Each structure stands twice: as structure tokens, then as C-alpha cells.
Design an enzyme around this catalytic site. Structure first.
Site, PDB file in Angstrom:
ATOM      1  CB  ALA C  59      -6.521  -7.370   2.301  1.00 43.33           C
ATOM      2  CG  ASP C  60      -5.342  -1.751   3.787  1.00 43.19           C
ATOM      3  OD1 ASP C  60      -5.018  -1.407   2.503  1.00 43.19           O
ATOM      4  OD2 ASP C  60      -4.293  -1.509   4.399  1.00 43.19           O
ATOM      5  NE  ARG C  61     -12.718  -1.592   6.580  1.00 43.05           N
ATOM      6  CZ  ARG C  61     -13.198  -1.465   8.068  1.00 43.05           C
ATOM      7  NH1 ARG C  61     -14.206  -1.900   8.630  1.00 43.05           N
ATOM      8  NH2 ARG C  61     -12.657  -0.595   8.720  1.00 43.05           N
TER       9      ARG C  61
END
Lengths: 191, 210, 191, 211
Positions: C59-61
Site C-alpha cells: 500500500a501507499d496510503r
């Protein structure tokens, strides 16, 4: 009246039929188009400012029950279209009908050399400034770059199989074939 | 530009065939001459020609170029695979070469469908000269029906979608997705899926005249 | 007892994190792996000799409701996993949690230079013999090739958004978070 | 270590060194990019020479530390002349501006913002540059060491969770998994997130086949 306003062709790895060839024809014909990665279909649908209302694919082999061998990624596009409620059509001539093979499970699927996946062919670009490299005569140059380790195994099927349940219509020179209430195509006229 | 196969049919007894190397597009436009079934096999296997119908067409044409070469010159390398004095022995070698050509790429069925029709034409041929002329007519029709059928199916599909949309109450601009290449580069011209797209674009341009 | 016997990393266009980086790590660690195109997920599932039982993505965010921004293609993978009944897990540390943004629609998605899509970077390959082209110090030379017409527009989002409805679990150093019966994550402990 | 995105030599707390693998050039080319200032941090992030959400946060954070140590050790350096070192408040103003610049490198992954917020909080409670330097060193060590430890923890959590799910469903065979992007040692301080889980699963599988 509804009208088509935009085309989203997929790059179509690994040979890149979409980016090198389809994008070329679309530019030539001046049809409004945006090329997307194969991986971008779902997000493109969710964000498109123009509603996507159909996918059109070709075929390499349509068998007696309508199951379709086409370019790897076609089954996947069919699945994504099902999930998003987008009509999915196979477009092909009678010459692409196999009138003997009964179902998609019996289709032989070409797998190609792993180097055609791991190595990408394109026109050579200056890695510092991004312009085309031209030869002495001012022509573009063909080049190849490797994008994966020598050591990695790859899977390189040239086609996948889309079952007829996922196909909304088969469009031919003889008309559009759709499923009966039993979920079966009736392609007998094309045999 | 977009013509995958360049077939000079203007001299029926001495045709010429060359194909765009699709490996090198779009920046590089280079042709490969087709003289024998070997060349046909090679451009198909290596995907210098690709697209199901274009494969069938180049394959079929390669048989024509081979037959005409062995007619014009019994001493060429490919010719020495044949005993041309003997029709039955020749047909046999042709049939074997057709099987070789078939093995180029297995999945798309168009090639097989054409080669079956060619084997049938060969069985009804009394000699190499009769086969030559009949194969010429066959390949001409394969190509010509391919283009005309591409445009017919293009129109059929466009009419169909607009139909379905209008019935469902959809009245606006829309977009479509497509995959691979199914245009003029994959066929005799115009194409299949891309042919429907081309027909839809014509419909769209027409409608934004009004 | 069940055990993982194979990994299928996706190429991950356009930057090729999968083919260039993940395949490298898997090779290094001697983990049995087969790299596949992004377009091959659906056909890979239908044909795999070893049943695919999970997808794991990073995930990035991750925002307050569990909606997740990750590499472009992640949404697509989740949708395909849904179609095929395969569990889909996002794996990320608390440092990847955004405890302010409420939902996926509010995430700003980076879009990158079109040339990063249309031009592929990789190691130069010898056109004659297919070996690596090396410089005078014996090191592989980087090259770039163009795989699309100059004239074609492209869409190059670096990320897509996977709505929490499609995520079976969020795996963190604090444990595995799952949805309640109303279909909501409760990530408060991570805020 | 072929797989280490960020090489952080912490052995001299007052004079750390940082270099990063150019991930644009992998896997055939192994080339390192030195990190000395926030401009270097910004540059490798924006260009995706370092990428991966946690690695971005780590290189960003480290580039602040190399910058403050450089301006201590070389007050005549180019970066140092950006600062009015005579005055702590004036120094902080420029540092904060450069932290905002760094933040602008790439927006979507939140790790970087999360770290820069913490670094700003540290800056606001430091009485002078020396104190900030020391506390930032502690911060980056903790960020990195926790990243690695937590990657191993989450890897094991995820592996156990899937095995338990399969064991409940009565699945007893070999299975495969799908993954996307890069989430391994190249995206993090090491071991990784989704690839961490895969690594933990592989350890479990090796134990079983050994037996």
C-alpha cells in the site's frame, strides 16, 4: 443519439500490438484515443469522464460453442467488463470459426519463447535527453532492452480462452450472434 | 503505411508479395519479400506478419509464390524438392510443405481453414499449371472477401451497439475499450474489432454534422 | 499441511517494479516463482497447476475507511480476485496509515510523464547475439526504447484506488484487520 | 547486499553516510547515488531512483540528517549558504521550507508526510541545531529499525493468518500466491511488506518440505 467519442486501446504486452500497432492505426485515422496499460482497465472505467459502454475484441479461434481464443488478456478484459457491467463483444469473420472443436478446453494455446517477454523491442531513445536516435541516414534505429533477470522463469502464452458465458455477442459479416435463454450461442449457420 | 501485405496481382502468372515487418513498427517501415513457403513459414513463426487473417493470407500467398517459382525455374533451391516431371510426386511434396506451413503457429484457425481449401483445390487440379491459376483465383478471393467482410461486420457491429444503447435509453457520448491489433495491420485492411470502431467513428462524425 | 509452493509476481507496467525488482528479489532468495504479464492474471488463475489461494499487495496510503491507494493495477487485481473467489490482502505498516483522509475518492493520485509509459528502460541487448552489451568497465549499459507513436496520448496514473469492499484483510505489524458484518474496517487502533 | 535499497552507515552518529541503489537501473546495473542534502533526497524520490513507500520516507528522512550534518561540518558549503546560521529561528525557517520542498517530491504515498510531520515536531522541540541533529539521528535509527522489525512481524502475521484460513477450510496441498509491484527489501528497510509475507510463507514451506 449516442455516439462514440473516445477509444482506450490496451498496450497488450508482451508483443505490444496495442501500443506499437493499434495506437499507430488510431493516430493515422485521427480517431480520439488514449492508450492505457493492460493493468489500468479497472481504474480507467472507474474514472473515465466519458462512460465506457463496450469492449470490442477480435478472435483467433471461435469454437462450436462460441468459446474464443484471443490475445492473452482477453479473458481478463472480459472478466473486468462483466464486473463493471460493460458489454463485451467478439468481432470476427467466418474464417475464424473452428467448426470441429467443441469447447474452449480443447483449444491448443501457443506459448512463446521467454525472451520475447523479457526483452522489449522498440526504437532507440537517447537515455539522457529522450530524443530518437537516428542513424547516419537520419532513420530511426531498432533496439532491444532487457527488463527482467536472466534467472526468472516466465509464463508467455500468446492467447487466453474466454468462455462463451462472458461474451455478450459475436459480431460477423453475417450478423450479430447472441445467446438464447439457455445461455448458448447458435453458430450453426457459420459452420 | 498500414497495409500489412503488399500483393501485386496485376500479372496473374507472376505475382509479387512483400510484407511489412510488424516487429519494427511504428518507427521503422521495412518490407520482407515472400518467394517460398519457407518465407511464409518464417514471417509467420517470427511474427513479422501477425493477426489471424493476415497470417492466413501471407501463408496462402506463399504457396502461390512457391508454385510459380517452381514453374518458372525447375533449378531453384526450392524446386529441387520437387520432381516436376511427375504430377503425383509433386502434389505429395506440396502437401508436405502445406503441413510444414501449418505448423508455423497453431492457435488462430484461419491459416488451417485456408490450407484445407488449398488442399481441396490441389486435389481437383490436373497439373501444376491448373493449380497455379486456381490458387491465384482463390487467394484473390480470400483477400477480397476479407476486406469486404471486414467492412460489413464493422457496420453490423456499429449499428448493433448504437441500437442497444438507444433502446437502453443511453443518448450521450461514450467510450470503448479494445485489445491487441485487429485493424489493417492484422488483416487485408480495415479489420475486425478495429473495423467496428472505425464504423462507430464514421457514425460519430456524421452525427456531429447535425 | 498447506504450504506455499510458488509465487506469480506481475510485471507491473509501466515502471516494471515486478519484472525488474521483485523478480530480482525472488531470484536472490531462491523462491520458486514465475513472472507473468499484468494481463495474464485471469488466465493464470484458470490454468495454474498449483491453486492460487491469495494475492498479497502493499500500500501507499490506507485512509480511514481502509480504502487503499497502491500501484496502478491493484484495483484490477482485486476485482479479478473477487471474480475468482481468491482472498485479497493489503499488507502495510502503521506508517502507511492516513488517519485524516476519510475515503478513497479524496486521495490525490500522482500521474507521471507520458514518456515514462511510452519509453521502456532496460539493459541494452546485443541485436546480433542477444547477450548483454557492456561498457569498457564490464558493466551492463542502460538503454531506452520507444514502444508507441509520438502522437498517441497516454494515461499514466502511478496508482489506483481499491475500495475497502474488495479487501479481505489489512495485514500489519499490529495484526490482521478484517471487516465487520456491516462491511466496515475498524482501523481506529492504528490512528 | 544486492537487495538493500538504502545503505545507511550509522557507525559515526555525528557523521552518517547514506547512499541508495538507483532502482531505475536494476537488475543488471548496480549503481549507488550518494545522499548529502535535501536536494538529493528530493531528486532520488521525484525521479524514482528510490521508490517504495517506506523507502521514500527513509531516504527523505535521512537526507534531512545528512543536510544538517553537512552544514555543521562545512559552513561554507553551497547548501550551508542557504542558511542564516547565526540565528536558530532563521535557520528553522529555511529548514522548514526545505522540508516542504522535500514533501512535494511525490504526493500519493503517505509515509513521507508521516515522517516529515514527526521531524518537524522534533525540530520544534530542539533548542539548537546540535540538539536537532542528535534527536534526528535517534529518529531515523528508530524509523529504520522499526520498519525492519515490523516488516518481519507483519510478514509472520500474514503468513500465519493465511495458513490458518487454509487449515480451517481443509486445504492441505501446495498453493501459489499473486503479488504486484515491489514491496521487498528494495521498497523498505529490508524484508518487506507483501513480499515479507511471501518470505515468511517460504520459510514455513521450507520447514515443511525439509521434514
Amino acid at each position: 443519439c449516442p455516439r462514440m467519442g473516445h477509444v482506450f486501446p490496451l498496450e497488450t504486452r508482451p508483443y505490444n500490438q496495442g501500443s506499437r500497432l493499434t495506437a499507430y492505426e488510431l493516430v493515422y485515422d485521427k480517431i480520439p484515443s488514449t492508450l492505457i496499460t493492460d493493468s489500468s482497465i479497472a481504474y480507467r472505467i472507474r474514472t473515465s469522464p466519458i462512460p465506457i459502454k463496450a469492449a470490442f475484441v477480435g478472435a483467433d479461434r471461435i469454437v462450436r460453442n462460441g468459446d474464443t481464443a484471443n490475445k492473452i488478456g482477453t479473458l481478463q478484459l472480459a472478466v473486468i467488463c462483466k464486473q463493471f457491467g460493460i458489454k463485451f463483444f467478439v468481432v470476427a469473420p467466418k474464417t475464424t470459426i473452428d467448426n470441429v472443436t467443441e469447447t474452449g478446453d480443447d483449444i491448443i494455446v501457443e506459448e512463446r519463447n521467454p525472451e520475447e517477454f523479457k526483452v522489449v523491442t522498440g526504437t532507440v531513445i537517447n537515455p539522457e535527453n529522450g530524443s530518437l536516435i537516428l542513424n547516419e541516414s537520419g532513420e530511426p534505429i531498432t533496439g532491444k532492452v532487457g527488463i527482467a533477470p536472466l534467472e526468472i522463469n516466465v509464463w508467455n502464452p500468446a492467447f487466453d480462452i474466454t468462455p462463451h458465458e462472458l461474451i455478450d455477442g459475436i459480431i460477423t459479416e453475417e450478423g450479430v450472434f447472441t445467446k438464447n435463454s439457455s445461455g448458448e450461442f447458435q453458430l450453426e449457420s457459420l459452420f | 503505411s498500414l497495409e500489412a501485405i503488399v500483393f501485386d496481382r496485376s500479372e496473374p502468372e507472376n505475382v509479387s508479395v512483400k510484407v511489412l515487418d510488424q516487429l519494427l513498427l511504428p518507427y521503422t517501415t521495412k518490407y520482407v519479400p515472400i518467394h517460398t513457403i519457407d518465407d511464409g513459414y518464417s514471417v509467420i513463426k517470427s511474427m513479422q506478419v501477425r493477426g489471424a487473417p493476415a497470417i492466413a493470407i501471407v501463408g496462402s500467398l506463399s504457396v502461390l509464390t512457391e508454385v510459380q517459382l517452381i514453374k518458372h525455374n525447375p533449378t531453384s533451391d526450392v524446386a529441387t524438392l520437387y520432381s516436376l516431371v511427375n504430377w503425383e510426386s509433386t502434389k505429395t511434396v506440396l502437401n508436405k510443405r502445406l503441413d510444414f506451413l501449418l505448423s508455423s503457429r497453431p492457435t488462430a484457425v484461419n491459416l488451417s481453414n485456408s490450407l484445407v481449401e488449398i488442399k481441396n483445390i490441389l486435389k481437383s487440379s490436373s497439373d501444376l499449371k491448373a493449380f497455379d491459376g486456381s490458387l491465384y483465383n482463390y487467394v484473390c478471393e480470400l483477400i477480397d472477401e476479407d476486406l469486404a467482410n471486414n467492412m460489413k461486420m464493422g457496420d453490423n457491429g456499429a449499428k448493433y451497439l448504437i441500437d442497444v444503447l438507444q433502446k437502453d435509453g443511453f443518448k450521450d457520448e461514450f467510450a470503448v475499450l479494445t485489445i491487441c491489433n485487429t485493424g489493417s495491420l492484422a488483416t487485408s485492411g480495415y479489420g475486425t474489432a478495429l473495423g467496428v470502431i472505425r464504423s462507430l467513428w464514421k457514425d460519430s462524425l456524421a452525427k456531429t454534422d447535425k
